[PDB]
Write a protein that binds this ligand. Structure first.
Ligand SMILES: *[C@@H]1O[C@H](CO)[C@@H](O[C@@H]2O[C@H](CO)[C@@H](O)[C@H](O)[C@H]2NC(C)=O)[C@H](O)[C@H]1NC(C)=O
Ligand SMILES: *[C@@H]1O[C@H](CO)[C@@H](O[C@@H]2O[C@H](CO)[C@@H](O)[C@H](O)[C@H]2NC(C)=O)[C@H](O)[C@H]1NC(C)=O
Ligand SMILES: *[C@@H]1O[C@H](CO)[C@@H](O[C@@H]2O[C@H](CO)[C@@H](O)[C@H](O)[C@H]2NC(C)=O)[C@H](O)[C@H]1NC(C)=O
Ligand SMILES: *[C@@H]1O[C@H](CO)[C@@H](O[C@@H]2O[C@H](CO)[C@@H](O)[C@H](O)[C@H]2NC(C)=O)[C@H](O)[C@H]1NC(C)=O
Ligand SMILES: *[C@@H]1O[C@H](CO)[C@@H](O[C@@H]2O[C@H](CO)[C@@H](O)[C@H](O)[C@H]2NC(C)=O)[C@H](O)[C@H]1NC(C)=O
Ligand SMILES: *[C@@H]1O[C@H](CO)[C@@H](O[C@@H]2O[C@H](CO)[C@@H](O)[C@H](O)[C@H]2NC(C)=O)[C@H](O)[C@H]1NC(C)=O
Ligand SMILES: *[C@@H]1O[C@H](CO)[C@@H](O)[C@H](O)[C@H]1NC(C)=O
Ligand SMILES: *[C@@H]1O[C@H](CO)[C@@H](O)[C@H](O)[C@H]1NC(C)=O
Ligand SMILES: *[C@@H]1O[C@H](CO)[C@@H](O)[C@H](O)[C@H]1NC(C)=O
Ligand SMILES: *[C@@H]1O[C@H](CO)[C@@H](O)[C@H](O)[C@H]1NC(C)=O
Ligand SMILES: *[C@@H]1O[C@H](CO)[C@@H](O)[C@H](O)[C@H]1NC(C)=O
Ligand SMILES: *[C@@H]1O[C@H](CO)[C@@H](O)[C@H](O)[C@H]1NC(C)=O
Ligand SMILES: *[C@@H]1O[C@H](CO)[C@@H](O)[C@H](O)[C@H]1NC(C)=O
Lengths: 167, 425, 197
């Protein structure tokens, strides 16, 4: 097998030589020479995402190793979505531009570089509420807004026999 | 044999009307799933975990793995889309003033708790307490529970400080009792009913909120629809993992035993069986996930519609924002879902009266401008339709149309003329 | 802005492309071209290599059709929403909040789009709000007065009754208001003179 072996506290009985997981994979073993129990774990794995502005905008990209600590793998930032490399973490908060996860978003900003930040949910606004104050509009605007709704897809017919056994 | 309900014959007749003399403020809870867990399965790792011999054999199946990955990625992205649609319905982050002079209404148990690390409300904490390495990974949601709590806090603050004006333009402040008067007008009750019963109405609202708190803190299985989604996802993943122990006609279900004991010519035969079985298992899982995600998306669309039409407005749709005449709704974030506290108006204590469609005074038929004609046995009044507030029938209460030879059920009575005493005097 | 449509198109295209590319997979056979197998091997050995292609391509077609069913269900939901919106925004005026755009819906106009519809929602948005003092009722002769339609406002010194969604102050008269009870109940009631025409 392949993996990481670590000392384990599992209380193997003398007649047991290994333990299995739900998928029937050996999760622990007994070392045949020094009869100690070892836990076996997968080494480390996870998806790799590339955070990019448009190639029209720039060829500079950041990389997110999803669900990996920033030790298994410039700027290295430990997010809850994984390790982010090539993005400058900033204490400011903006609108989400490219979502990373756990509230972390990435955007290309000003010398220009890719930055990571905690996304903002909007502007704070304390309404001037009281028990005898009312706000009343004195004017108005007419707003025309567009909503786009799909209605249908393409009607396709597949000749099964010609697709599988064409002529 | 099950009972469909308690039989109840309505005391119907052609001149009898039941009119409520009182009311109750109900606060009902509706729970909607909004998203589900964002799972990802590395198809090659699940089928051929860390095995090149199996990977090269899986390359013979084309792109079957990449489209399973594409499907799971689409599901995971639309989960964040669902959450954003339901909760990002407020353009600004509104917060209530430090002064809580809300006409005697108490929102302390649905407003954020500054003391806690996450500024959740008391009921939000109850809700979050009540709901509980083989190529499989779980991606965190884009919005944290703190951000969803902030969105619900902003929605609640906007509703409580401005009414429905923040969902149409800029949030315009209004005293909360005057907002409740607007709601009473919107359900067909005259606003003097709200002002004259303001303390009673506020007490009823506070009691209903307290009952919501007690029920949530007592009944464990209150958020059963969220727990159902969680259990379904857990069962699906457990089945997917347990399918890794199936032989599928091979000597072993462990790819490493096959590779350790057999040479490539014989190992490939067993690895092909394992690949076939595990690929079928993955495809079944992904199809079930797509169907479940479509269901969750429908639920989240309903939740976003309810947010818009019950929290950002007052709905006339029957039973859309709770049972009864909708007054208002309050959102509370729940794990992977939303809870709506629907404040509704329920007529309470009805009484029988004798009623007439019209009244004859001087050969003219009179009809109520607003309301219905009722009789307490000897005298005739005109009351509003959803609350018994009898008033003398005058020419301002009613309007005339034709004569009395047409209306069926018309009764003789006098219609007072307010100008007559002034002119005579 | 048209992404919602283009995405759908892309999806369909992608699916078809995948299906076509699944005809270049061996699925264990010596070749992904059926004529190559037929033109080189005898039937006893050709059938063995053709069965693998048949299995793989049947699985690919089933995958395609199932994905198409799921996507068609999604498109059906979208089209039902579009038909409801046509009915309630183009053929009417909706009170449903945010159903026919953001604001107070005035009307909607439909435009045909490739495999879709566009709705131009005309809505009314209040623009320039001013602060005023306000009361739930007004006392004139020991009687509480409430606005028939509107809200009582004060510009600092004088009390008017205005409609709620647009500042149009007017004198408080017995035609603007109605009386219900005395002044010992309403919380926040203020004293002012109600005009009698
Ligand atoms: C309408 O119902 C409310 C209760 O929902 C009544 O208020 C109760 O009145 C009794 C007697 O005055 C008190 O003992 C209770 O404590 C009150 N309850 C609350 C919640 O305040 C009210 O009296 C009823 N009104 C009419 C006209 O029947
Ligand atoms: C709103 O309700 C909460 C509880 O429902 C009130 O908080 C209680 O206050 C009393 C005395 O002030 C305490 O004895 C309780 O322990 C408190 N309970 C909780 C859960 O905090 C709160 O005072 C109410 N708000 C107003 C303005 O009356
Ligand atoms: C129906 O309502 C009328 C008006 O309220 C009642 O007549 C009044 O009864 C009260 C009883 O105390 C008297 O104080 C008033 O002087 C009466 N006014 C008039 C104009 O008659 C009448 O009694 C009610 N009938 C029933 C059956 O309840
Ligand atoms: C309501 O009042 C009208 C008139 O006050 C009544 O009409 C009278 O009916 C009697 C009986 O047929 C006639 O003799 C009179 O000539 C009618 N008067 C007029 C002016 O036409 C009517 O009957 C009353 N309705 C009820 C139910 O009592
Ligand atoms: C509130 O409104 C009233 C009425 O519009 C104002 O009173 C008038 O003010 C104008 C100022 O141009 C005078 O010309 C009128 O003679 C006033 N009429 C009366 C009946 O007083 C009042 O000044 C306004 N107050 C504020 C603070 O804006
Ligand atoms: C509105 O006017 C009434 C009467 O004009 C005021 O009530 C008076 O209040 C004073 C002081 O509290 C008492 O000495 C009088 O006896 C009251 N008169 C009556 C008829 O009740 C009332 O205070 C005024 N309201 C405001 C807000 O100024
Ligand atoms: C890149 O984007 C900008 C605006 O975002 C646009 O003006 C420009 O034409 C784009 N470049 C190309 C090559 O299309
Ligand atoms: C990464 O590992 C270090 C030590 O190995 C640990 O302190 C840290 O908490 C880990 N990362 C996270 C996000 O927990
Ligand atoms: C943000 O500010 C804190 C000070 O509270 C500082 O320690 C931290 O380094 C800052 N972050 C960055 C990316 O500079
Ligand atoms: C009205 O009268 C009927 C007579 O059968 C009675 O059954 C019913 O309870 C009455 N309604 C009310 C509200 O008292
Ligand atoms: C209402 O019903 C009663 C039942 O006996 C009947 O006598 C009366 O004529 C009816 N009223 C009308 C207007 O038909
Ligand atoms: C209304 O009063 C509040 C109180 O602070 C103020 O912030 C706001 O600007 C006022 N409204 C207008 C339109 O000036
Ligand atoms: C409104 O709130 C203030 C607090 O500053 C209070 O003094 C006043 O009495 C309140 N109004 C009413 C009608 O209770």
């Amino acid at each position: 097998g392949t993996g990481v072996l670590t000392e384990s506290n599992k209380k193997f009985l003398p007649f047991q030589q290994f333990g299995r997981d739900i998928a029937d994979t050996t999760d622990a073993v007994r070392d045949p020479q020094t009869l100690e129990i070892l836990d076996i774990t997968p080494c480390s794995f996870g998806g790799v995402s590339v955070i990019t502005p448009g190639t029209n905008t720039s060829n500079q990209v950041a990389v997110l190793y999803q669900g990996v600590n920033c030790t298994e793998v410039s700027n290295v930032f430990q997010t809850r979505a994984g390790c982010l490399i090539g993005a400058e973490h900033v204490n400011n908060s903006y609108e989400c531009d490219i979502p990373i996860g756990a509230g972390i978003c990435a955007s290309y900003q000003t010398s220009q570089s890719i930055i990571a930040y905690t996304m903002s949910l909007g502007v704070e606004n304390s309404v001037a509420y009281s028990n005898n104050s009312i706000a009343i509009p004195t004017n108005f605007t007419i707003s025309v807004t567009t909503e786009i709704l799909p209605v249908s897809m393409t009607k396709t017919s597949v000749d099964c026999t010609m697709y599988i056994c064409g002529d | 044999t099950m009972s469909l309900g308690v039989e109840n014959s309505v005391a119907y007749s052609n001149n009898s009307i039941a009119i409520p003399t009182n009311f109750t403020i109900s606060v009902t809870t509706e729970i909607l799933p909004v998203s589900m867990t964002k799972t990802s399965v590395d198809c090659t790792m699940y089928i051929c975990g860390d095995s090149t011999e199996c990977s090269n054999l899986l390359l013979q199946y084309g792109s079957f793995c990449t489209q399973l990955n594409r499907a799971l990625t689409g599901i995971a992205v639309e989960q964040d889309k669902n959450t954003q649609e339901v909760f990002a319905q407020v353009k600004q982050i509104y917060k209530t003033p430090p002064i809580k002079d809300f006409g005697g209404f108490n929102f302390s148990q649905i407003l954020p708790d500054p003391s806690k690390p996450s500024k959740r409300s008391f009921i939000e904490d109850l809700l979050f307490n009540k709901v509980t390495f083989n190529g499989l990974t779980v991606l965190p949601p884009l919005l944290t529970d703190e951000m969803i709590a902030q969105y619900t806090s902003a929605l609640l603050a906007g509703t409580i400080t401005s009414g429905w004006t923040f969902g149409a333009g800029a949030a315009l402040q209004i005293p909360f009792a005057m907002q409740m008067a607007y709601r009473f007008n919107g359900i067909g009750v005259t606003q003097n009913v709200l002002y004259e019963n303001q303390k009673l109405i506020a007490n009823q609202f506070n009691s209903a909120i307290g009952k919501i708190q007690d029920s949530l803190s007592s009944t464990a299985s209150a958020l059963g629809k969220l727990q159902d989604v969680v259990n379904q996802n857990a069962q699906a993943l457990n089945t997917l993992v347990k399918q890794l122990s199936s032989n599928f006609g091979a000597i072993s279900s462990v790819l490493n035993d096959i590779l350790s004991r057999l040479d490539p010519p014989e190992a490939e035969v067993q690895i092909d069986r394992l690949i076939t079985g595990r690929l079928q298992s993955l495809q079944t899982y992904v199809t079930q996930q797509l169907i479940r995600a479509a269901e969750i998306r429908a639920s989240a669309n309903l939740a976003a519609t309810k947010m818009s039409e019950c929290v950002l407005g007052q709905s006339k749709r029957v039973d859309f924002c709770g049972k009864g005449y909708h007054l208002m709704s309050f959102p509370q974030s729940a794990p992977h879902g939303v809870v709506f506290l629907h404040v509704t108006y329920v007529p309470a204590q009805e009484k029988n009266f004798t009623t007439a469609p019209a009244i004859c005074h001087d050969g003219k038929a009179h009809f109520p401008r607003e309301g219905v004609f009722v009789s307490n046995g000897t005298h005739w009044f005109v009351t509003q339709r959803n609350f018994y507030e009898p008033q003398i029938i005058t020419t301002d209460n009613t309007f005339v149309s034709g004569n009395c030879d047409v209306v069926i059920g018309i009764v003789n009575n006098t219609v007072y003329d307010p100008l007559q005493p002034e002119l005579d005097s």
